[PDB]
Amino acid sequence: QKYASIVGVDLLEEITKDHKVLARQQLQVLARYLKMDLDNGERKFLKEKDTVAELQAQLDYLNAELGEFFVN
């Protein structure tokens, strides 16, 4: 805008869906070969999660019985 003013001169998908799937495919079969698990990055995260819910389940039982003035 500044430059223009400084001078005065004003002024479908499936071709990609399957183009994706084989990549998604060539990925998985390629992971068969290195024996590289793509899902430990979630099994870790999932077990890490429910042993946080049941860890909170303790931590809020105390605030439910000791009171948030005592625990604090």
Binding site: D18, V21, L22, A23, R24, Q25, Q26, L27, Q28, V29
Partner: protein
């Protein structure tokens, strides 16, 4: 019989797409009338098994 594991009938998870699917040489005999005419045959011996 483990009442916490009552067994039933289900299906599983998916992959990246490259798949026709074969068979072996054991129980062809009782077990041959499900599918239909759904092959990419080559009856010329260039293959072997």
């Amino acid at each position: 019989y483990n009442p916490e594991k009552k067994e039933m009938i289900q299906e599983v998870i998916v992959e990246e797409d490259l798949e026709p699917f074969e068979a072996s040489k054991e129980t062809a005999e009782q077990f041959k009338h499900q599918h239909g005419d759904k092959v990419d045959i080559f009856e010329i011996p260039e293959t072997g098994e």
